Amino acid sequence: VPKYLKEPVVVGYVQRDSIAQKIGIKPGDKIIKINGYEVRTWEDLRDALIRLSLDGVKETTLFLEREGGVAMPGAEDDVVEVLHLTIKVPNVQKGEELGIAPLVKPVVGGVKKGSPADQVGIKPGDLILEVNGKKINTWYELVEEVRKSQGKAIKLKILRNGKMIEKELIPAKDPKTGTYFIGLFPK
Amino acid sequence: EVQLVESGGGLVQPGRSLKLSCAASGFTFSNYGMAWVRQTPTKGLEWIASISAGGDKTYYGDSVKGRFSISRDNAKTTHYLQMDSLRSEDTATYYCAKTSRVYFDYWGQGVMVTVSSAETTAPSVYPLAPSMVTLGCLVKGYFPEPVTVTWNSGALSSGVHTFPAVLQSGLYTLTSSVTVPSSTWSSQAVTCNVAHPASSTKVDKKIVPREC
Amino acid sequence: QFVLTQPNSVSTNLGSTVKLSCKRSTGNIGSNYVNWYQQHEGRSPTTMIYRDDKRPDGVPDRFSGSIDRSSNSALLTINNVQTEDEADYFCHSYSSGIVFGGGTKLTVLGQPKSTPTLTVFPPSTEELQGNKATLVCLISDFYPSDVEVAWKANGAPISQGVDTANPTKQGNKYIASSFLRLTAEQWRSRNSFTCQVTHEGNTVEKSLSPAECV
């Protein structure tokens, strides 16, 4: 069982053109309710979204908290900013998803044999800092920029046990699936 | 919706005091901090004061040297700004604002405050008369800004233009116009409603066809 | 503690993409949130962007804020710039105190040209009983703002007692007014009074006459 399933739902990443992106859910948001179902863990949101879709619910309420950073002078005593939203329940039978991802850092958990990843020499346990000069925090950010790199060389910066190495790669199409891939496994 | 409406502005002689008010509605007042931000055409938006949600902590800008005192009454959902020792450089439009942790989420309508020794002058309002007819009202010789003009107590809202005033010899003069079909001018009456809050003056003038 | 520096004015064309900058003098841009406010002419500021990039409900998705800790400058971006986007824009931040930017007056060009319409008004009889006369010339529905207003008495140019207001923007186009102050006898002493507006080569004019009723 994955570890994030018990942690609170703090949005680490939102996919574009998804239900969550179009509705305005941003990274750092914390989902606390949907219809109903109280949401304290990622497991709750997953099970609630499955039952809602199977029950035929197409629209429902989604309560969300948006906080962080240093308080503004005079506004330190303000109550938490809660957001009442009307979400479009993703059709779980058709494979739809809400479009939000947890906060897991891009630490590699495995490298495929012969795949263009040992090509340059990236090892498991490596922490992917940034990609192409783009500061990232989650693994889904790096997968975003493999398929829109359109075969061009991508530059990545990796921290290994203390030292920060720089490694580039260029792999693209594949005959089996038909998409771009690099050859890295999340932990 | 969140509503913040200011009150208690106008004209003051240099050195005397004014207390601005800001009535809030449409949200839990005591759950959020309030603030006051003034605006001059020369400086722009300048923060003045801020008070915490409970009313225990207060924060003041640089231009206030212990003169202004911001308070709030969570029972009436209203916060206030006492302004003592006013100078001519304090003449500005004063907005109250609601906070949401890290920013001002909603602003008021702003109230004009004029610090001058020149007394207030109520405007003289004159009717303006010459298919679609264009009527008007001349708001002549008032001080200070602003004035508001409505037509038929607000019932005539489309085709209403309130032109900015001209300044001449320390007095303002503007014109407000409304374009109405003559079918409405002949059947029912047309009236402009001028208000000059600084002098607590309200004036109505019916637009009747010309004479000789 | 620190100030925020904005370009005082930025001119862009309709349909393009404007980037309004907000440079923080000292300190890190990311240690405090940056918020953007839009203030139309004579209206109250509303929130366009809060918490660096969060857009409130109602604000069109053409607006988007960003943080650049490299240059310590915040950027408000407006794609497919519309006519209603022409306003003032103030960036905002805080620390020990609360700081506002200087404001950027976003002027947007390319909107279609329009010729001024004119409405003149004779002096009211109630003002004439005070032995004073004020001729009103209303100028509406015209773009751009640059205009020239002049008066004439029986066709002869008169340049004494003329007060003209600066052109202001109301909705989609511009607005202006002009006044000619005369005495009740000066008003009756002439056969014709003409308000003349010259806007981009064109010359529009309407006239007033005191000899209406016999």
Tab-separated table of N, CA and C in Angstrom, chain A residues 67-81, chain B residues 31-33 51-53 56-57 59 99-104:
chain	number	residue	atom	x	y	z
A	67	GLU	N	-4.242	27.853	2.111
A	67	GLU	CA	-3.449	28.625	3.056
A	67	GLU	C	-1.973	28.318	2.841
A	68	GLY	N	-1.133	29.114	3.476
A	68	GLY	CA	0.307	28.969	3.390
A	68	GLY	C	0.985	30.320	3.450
A	69	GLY	N	2.297	30.285	3.675
A	69	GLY	CA	3.093	31.493	3.677
A	69	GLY	C	2.957	32.313	4.947
A	70	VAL	N	3.616	33.469	4.926
A	70	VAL	CA	3.638	34.374	6.069
A	70	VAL	C	2.399	35.260	6.037
A	71	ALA	N	1.797	35.471	7.205
A	71	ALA	CA	0.589	36.278	7.285
A	71	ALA	C	0.896	37.753	7.053
A	72	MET	N	-0.079	38.451	6.499
A	72	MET	CA	-0.017	39.887	6.268
A	72	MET	C	-0.328	40.633	7.565
A	73	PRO	N	0.373	41.737	7.843
A	73	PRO	CA	0.092	42.505	9.066
A	73	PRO	C	-1.373	42.887	9.203
A	74	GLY	N	-1.990	42.494	10.315
A	74	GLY	CA	-3.390	42.743	10.566
A	74	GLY	C	-4.308	41.594	10.204
A	75	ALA	N	-3.857	40.683	9.340
A	75	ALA	CA	-4.659	39.553	8.889
A	75	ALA	C	-4.194	38.231	9.491
A	76	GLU	N	-3.397	38.281	10.560
A	76	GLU	CA	-2.881	37.052	11.154
A	76	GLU	C	-3.964	36.284	11.901
A	77	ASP	N	-4.977	36.980	12.414
A	77	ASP	CA	-6.053	36.363	13.178
A	77	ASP	C	-7.208	35.882	12.309
A	78	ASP	N	-7.115	36.029	10.991
A	78	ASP	CA	-8.209	35.639	10.113
A	78	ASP	C	-8.418	34.130	10.148
A	79	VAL	N	-9.660	33.715	9.903
A	79	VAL	CA	-9.976	32.293	9.881
A	79	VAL	C	-9.480	31.674	8.578
A	80	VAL	N	-9.405	30.342	8.569
A	80	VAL	CA	-8.889	29.633	7.407
A	80	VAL	C	-9.794	29.873	6.207
A	81	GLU	N	-9.175	30.127	5.056
A	81	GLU	CA	-9.899	30.367	3.809
A	81	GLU	C	-10.415	29.034	3.278
B	31	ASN	N	-14.436	37.527	12.008
B	31	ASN	CA	-13.515	36.497	11.551
B	31	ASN	C	-12.379	37.043	10.697
B	32	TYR	N	-12.400	38.330	10.354
B	32	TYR	CA	-11.426	38.886	9.428
B	32	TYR	C	-10.979	40.259	9.901
B	33	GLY	N	-9.735	40.599	9.571
B	33	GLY	CA	-9.227	41.917	9.879
B	33	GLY	C	-9.671	42.950	8.859
B	51	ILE	N	-6.362	46.543	11.551
B	51	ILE	CA	-6.728	46.010	12.857
B	51	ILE	C	-7.026	44.523	12.713
B	52	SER	N	-6.637	43.746	13.721
B	52	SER	CA	-6.829	42.305	13.688
B	52	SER	C	-8.313	41.956	13.809
B	53	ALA	N	-8.615	40.677	13.569
B	53	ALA	CA	-10.002	40.219	13.556
B	53	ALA	C	-10.692	40.498	14.886
B	56	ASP	N	-7.689	43.356	18.734
B	56	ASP	CA	-6.674	43.490	19.772
B	56	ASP	C	-5.394	44.140	19.263
B	57	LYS	N	-4.989	43.842	18.031
B	57	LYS	CA	-3.748	44.349	17.464
B	57	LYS	C	-4.047	45.385	16.389
B	59	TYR	N	-2.027	48.046	13.399
B	59	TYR	CA	-0.828	48.329	12.620
B	59	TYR	C	-1.073	49.572	11.776
B	99	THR	N	-9.550	41.801	4.830
B	99	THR	CA	-8.371	40.984	4.599
B	99	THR	C	-8.744	39.508	4.583
B	100	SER	N	-7.896	38.720	3.914
B	100	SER	CA	-8.005	37.261	3.885
B	100	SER	C	-6.582	36.715	4.015
B	101	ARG	N	-6.067	36.746	5.247
B	101	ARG	CA	-4.778	36.165	5.616
B	101	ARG	C	-3.585	36.905	5.018
B	102	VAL	N	-3.533	37.043	3.691
B	102	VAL	CA	-2.341	37.542	3.015
B	102	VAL	C	-2.624	38.683	2.051
B	103	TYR	N	-3.860	39.171	1.962
B	103	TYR	CA	-4.178	40.218	0.997
B	103	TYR	C	-5.526	40.835	1.346
B	104	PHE	N	-5.850	41.920	0.643
B	104	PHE	CA	-7.164	42.552	0.720
B	104	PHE	C	-8.066	41.897	-0.319
